[PDB]
Amino acid sequence: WLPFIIIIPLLGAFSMPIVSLLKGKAKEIWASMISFATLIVGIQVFREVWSKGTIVYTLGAPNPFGKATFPIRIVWEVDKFGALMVLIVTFVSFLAVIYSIEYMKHDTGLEKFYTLILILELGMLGIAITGDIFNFYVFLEIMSIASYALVAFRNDTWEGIEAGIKYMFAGSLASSFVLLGIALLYGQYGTLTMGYLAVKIAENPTIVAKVALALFIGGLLFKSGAAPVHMWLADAHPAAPSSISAMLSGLVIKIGGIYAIARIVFSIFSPTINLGTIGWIIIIFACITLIVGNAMAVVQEDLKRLLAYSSVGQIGYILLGLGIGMVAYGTRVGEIALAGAIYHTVNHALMKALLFLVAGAVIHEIGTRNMNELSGLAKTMPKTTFAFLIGAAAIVGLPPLNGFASKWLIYESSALFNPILGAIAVIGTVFCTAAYVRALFTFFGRPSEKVTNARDPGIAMMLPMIILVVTIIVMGFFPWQISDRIMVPTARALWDVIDYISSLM
Amino acid sequence: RIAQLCKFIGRSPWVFHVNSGSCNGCDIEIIAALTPRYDAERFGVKLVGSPRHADILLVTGPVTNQSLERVKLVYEQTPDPKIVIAIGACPTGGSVFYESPFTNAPLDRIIPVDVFVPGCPPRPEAILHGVVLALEKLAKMIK
Amino acid sequence: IVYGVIGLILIYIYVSVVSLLFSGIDRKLVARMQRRIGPPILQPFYDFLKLMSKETIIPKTANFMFKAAPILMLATVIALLAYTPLGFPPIFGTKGDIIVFIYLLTLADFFLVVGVMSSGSPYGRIGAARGIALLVSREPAMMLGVFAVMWAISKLGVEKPFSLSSLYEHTIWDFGPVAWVAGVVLIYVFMAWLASEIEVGFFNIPEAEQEIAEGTLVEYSGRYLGIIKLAESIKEFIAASLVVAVLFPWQLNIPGVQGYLINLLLHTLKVFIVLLVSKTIFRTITGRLKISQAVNLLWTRVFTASVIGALLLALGV
Amino acid sequence: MFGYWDPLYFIIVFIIGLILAYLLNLWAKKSGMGTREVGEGTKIFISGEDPEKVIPGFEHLEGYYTGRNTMWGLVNGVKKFFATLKNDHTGLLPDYVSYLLMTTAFILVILLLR
Numbered sequence A: 001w002l003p004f005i006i007i008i009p010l011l012g013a014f015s016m017p018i019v020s021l022l023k024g025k026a027k028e029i030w031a032s033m034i035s036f037a038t039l040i041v042g043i044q045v046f047r048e049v050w051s052k053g054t055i056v057y058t059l060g061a062p063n064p065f066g067k068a069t070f071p072i073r074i075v076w077e078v079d080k081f082g083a084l085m086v087l088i089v090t091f092v093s094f095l096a097v098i099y100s101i102e103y104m105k106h107d108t109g110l111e112k113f114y115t116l117i118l119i120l121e122l123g124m125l126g127i128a129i130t131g132d133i134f135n136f137y138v139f140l141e142i143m144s145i146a147s148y149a150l151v152a153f154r155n156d157t158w159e160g161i162e163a164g165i166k167y168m169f170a171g172s173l174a175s176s177f178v179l180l181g182i183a184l185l186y187g188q189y190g191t192l193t194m195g196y197l198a199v200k201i202a203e204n205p206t207i208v209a210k211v212a213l214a215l216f217i218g219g220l221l222f223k224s225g226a227a228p229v230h231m232w233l234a235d236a237h238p239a240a241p242s243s244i245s246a247m248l249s250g251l252v253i254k255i256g257g258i259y260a261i262a263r264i265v266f267s268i269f270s271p272t273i274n275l276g277t278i279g280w281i282i283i284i285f286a287c288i289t290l291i292v293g294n295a296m297a298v299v300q301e302d303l304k305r306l307l308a309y310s311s312v313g314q315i316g317y318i319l320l321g322l323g324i325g326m327v328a329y330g331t332r333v334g335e336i337a338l339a340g341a342i343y344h345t346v347n348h349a350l351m352k353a354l355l356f357l358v359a360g361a362v363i364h365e366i367g368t369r370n371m372n373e374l375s376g377l378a379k380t381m382p383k384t385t386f387a388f389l390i391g392a393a394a395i396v397g398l399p400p401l402n403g404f405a406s407k408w409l410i411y412e413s414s415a416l417f418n419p420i421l422g423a424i425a426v427i428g429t430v431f432c433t434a435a436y437v438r439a440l441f442t443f444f445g446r447p448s449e450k451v452t453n454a455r456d457p458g459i460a461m462m463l464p465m466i467i468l469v470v471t472i473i474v475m476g477f478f479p480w481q482i483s484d485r486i487m488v489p490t491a492r493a494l495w496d497v498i499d500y501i502s503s504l505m
Numbered sequence B: 001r002i003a004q005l006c007k008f009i010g011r012s013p014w015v016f017h018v019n020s021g022s023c024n025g026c027d028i029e030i031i032a033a034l035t036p037r038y039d040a041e042r043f044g045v046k047l048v049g050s051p052r053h054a055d056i057l058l059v060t061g062p063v064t065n066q067s068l069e070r071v072k073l074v075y076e077q078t079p080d081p082k083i084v085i086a087i088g089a090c091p092t093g094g095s096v097f098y099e100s101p102f103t104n105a106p107l108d109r110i111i112p113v114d115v116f117v118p119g120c121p122p123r124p125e126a127i128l129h130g131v132v133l134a135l136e137k138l139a140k141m142i143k
Numbered sequence C: 001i002v003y004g005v006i007g008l009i010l011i012y013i014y015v016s017v018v019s020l021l022f023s024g025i026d027r028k029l030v031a032r033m034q035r036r037i038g039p040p041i042l043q044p045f046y047d048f049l050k051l052m053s054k055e056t057i058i059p060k061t062a063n064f065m066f067k068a069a070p071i072l073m074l075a076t077v078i079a080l081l082a083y084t085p086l087g088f089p090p091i092f093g094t095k096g097d098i099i100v101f102i103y104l105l106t107l108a109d110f111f112l113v114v115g116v117m118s119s120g121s122p123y124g125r126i127g128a129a130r131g132i133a134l135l136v137s138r139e140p141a142m143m144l145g146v147f148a149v150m151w152a153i154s155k156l157g158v159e160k161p162f163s164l165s166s167l168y169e170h171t172i173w174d175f176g177p178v179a180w181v182a183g184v185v186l187i188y189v190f191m192a193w194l195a196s197e198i199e200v201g202f203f204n205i206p207e208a209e210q211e212i213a214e215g216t217l218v219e220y221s222g223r224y225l226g227i228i229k230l231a232e233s234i235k236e237f238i239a240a241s242l243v244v245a246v247l248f249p250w251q252l253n254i255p256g257v258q259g260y261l262i263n264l265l266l267h268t269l270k271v272f273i274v275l276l277v278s279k280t281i282f283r284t285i286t287g288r289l290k291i292s293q294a295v296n297l298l299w300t301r302v303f304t305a306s307v308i309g310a311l312l313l314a315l316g317v
Numbered sequence D: 001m002f003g004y005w006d007p008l009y010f011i012i013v014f015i016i017g018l019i020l021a022y023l024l025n026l027w028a029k030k031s032g033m034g035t036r037e038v039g040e041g042t043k044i045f046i047s048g049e050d051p052e053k054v055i056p057g058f059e060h061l062e063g064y065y066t067g068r069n070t071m072w073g074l075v076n077g078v079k080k081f082f083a084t085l086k087n088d089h090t091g092l093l094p095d096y097v098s099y100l101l102m103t104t105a106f107i108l109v110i111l112l113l114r
């Protein structure tokens, strides 16, 4: 029941140019249906993996073994942590496809748009589902190419082809360090997989095995908001249609950039090297990212650039938790932080999608990126501003919402670990409170002369807001039930390497 | 239209006086009717700072031409049941300023006054007598 | 669970009776201190009813928060009553429940500032940026004192640490000779916090002074004003109940189903004695100060004494 | 942190507080007069919407949420911090490329030794 997450998006993507000859509005209603079926298949594969097992799969023979004693075919391994990424990427994608019917309809050539937005959520499943080391490179490349082609889409604007060039010419260099790592890691060991390579890596360590890790992690740190290399995101967010930035601040940062580091450190490169070195290497970038990302997220004057610099400062929490979760191996202290850095990914994806769709509606209605001229927007656009108020209260964490219990874990972990990093976190969470309180006081004021003639959006631009707000409220009634049934057993099966390489055999 | 729960404002009035061009003779009597010798807080009066709160306006001075819309502007913002007490011999037709091109006299032709208190300036017991008389009118008006 | 609703209704009715009566006794004492008869004792129970009587006015430039912030203020005060020490250990007191107290005592003032600032004319805009500077400036001074005393009463043994039900087990006054100095430094910082939270004395800045006497609440007019003048009095009772809980809880044992109310009366009497010094005397004896001088006093002569007290009390254990 | 079912009681007491506080307005709207809608703000009553005798209002305020100075020795260091960090982000492509190159070299040099 698990080939049907790759079959249905390929069948939607390769069949879109022959159903656009109906020249009406079938070119959208086919895309919405073919994106809706993937949600059903994602729920069922989530239920099947949480019932029992760590299921492997083999393309070809019923076993990954011929007349030999080592793998031949391409194998899939979807242990408990990939299932959450499969379950959360097939949800915001649906809520962002049914969104853009009324937005992005003044523009031309939206036959290529829907097939690109269906490729996006195709090259992002296969990173989660896979257990081969070269297949990872193709599925990291699909996502990057179509994300280059969705940023520079409005080609006639002054700076839509200015963000695209900046993202292109650096991403196409960072995505070749990975291919040099694979070329340099083939010729020394000889097999091309992720389970059986951790066996062969153990007997003969080489300088190749560390060279092919250094630039390997230095490449995957570009597809994130890591601290020296975070500048492409800051101008890729204002120069985008708002249905794209909701599926680029929430998802593509935390599939190609965090999940990959977690998988290729905790499973391949960890019977041999000290984890204590990679921990202190990661944790320095986690501490530069907080200050650099949330310090200049308070000097702004733009609206979407604010959210771009606020979505690079939440990555520092995830890197800090995932970094502390390595220098301490199996204990109580460094186990509740790896559990505290999984729950924050799913919460950050939900609230940042909710917080970009509302900025899309505001910027579509009156048309000015500046946040200083518009004030009293809640006089003549109330429901939009209330959605912004909930989405702003959920980031910093107020205890009736779900952003509280996702961050108390990182607080108590970093406080029981060392008392300096807790002070770093408290500085980093004072500055974001200052930014959102300031932008909140600009919206409850006197109605300025540029606002007074305005209305609300329709229904199909208002229906995702309801589902997101209901989800992140009812998800907040039960925080400590969902943090012991799901996301402690999730994080215990990340350093459980012996069962991984034993269920492959 | 005055419905029922307004007997209590006869036991707690709040005032706010509107100067329009006086010569500061009666404003002393508004202020000195609250010092410890002529004390008035034991009835419940309390000089408040905005016309949203108050319910007895306390207009002094002859209505000077420049202050003619202000008096008609601060009359809407006081809420319901409210009275107007005119203090002195210059809301009642000017005193020495009845023949100017600048002072349109009696304050009745601008807003509906209820109780006048003559004198120049009235002693502070006469102001207490005036507010007691107007308040018993509005107690009669309830029933 | 249903026995936790009966308390939350009945204690609310009790406190809403008592607090306004304390305010009336306070106005009578302040009036007698300067040769005056003064108003009768139950004077706020008339002012409340006449403010509910009148006609409410909504300005033409007003949001949906103008009509809905004086509901959320009273709501997060009534919901805060269930966590406060009334003399007996509170109803919903678990292992956390200090940060819930600090959070909900901060959050009501932010609802007040958002309700004032969400209107038209910019008297409210200047009367709100003066509010939140004084809000930020007065809450690192109490966090150090309360966290130091809650950490220090947990060494000698308790089962619900960092909880306000743990503050009746063992107090400050039995740690030996060095704690007697931290006692008076801590009496200093808590009396200063209690005077600056209910905002009377030096710190009468954002209430009856917007450039002369306009105030922050220059705009609320009818029912809404009555609700705000009720909520601030309940908060007046709550903060002083915290101050008498931390400093000296000396209650009777008296087992039975009626020792609760005897301890409740004894706590009410201690609340009265603590208000009588601070609010009455410090209001009669000293005028306003400023805003640029009210900030550099809470970071220099109050927050410094909290560090001295916490460090000296740490060197006692 | 607190309890196991304890974040569910918070909602119960909060909703019963809103029910009491909304029931009080539901009572007090009936007894007493209604409402109306005026606009001048009751704020310096001389003018509401006028043009010119001298200069007047409509000089609206931006986001200035600071009117205080602690020890007046911290604002200079904060501004000297934000100035360099503000003009670091130039926007030239060799900055991007040089940053990821020195990051790769830094991780390599640390991983060779220990």
Ligand code: SF4
Residues within 6 Å of the ligand: B022, B023, B024, B025, B026, B061, B062, B087, B088, B089, B090, B091, B095, B119, B120, B121
């Ligand atoms: S009423 Fe008489 S005493 Fe009063 S201001 Fe006018 S002239 Fe002066």
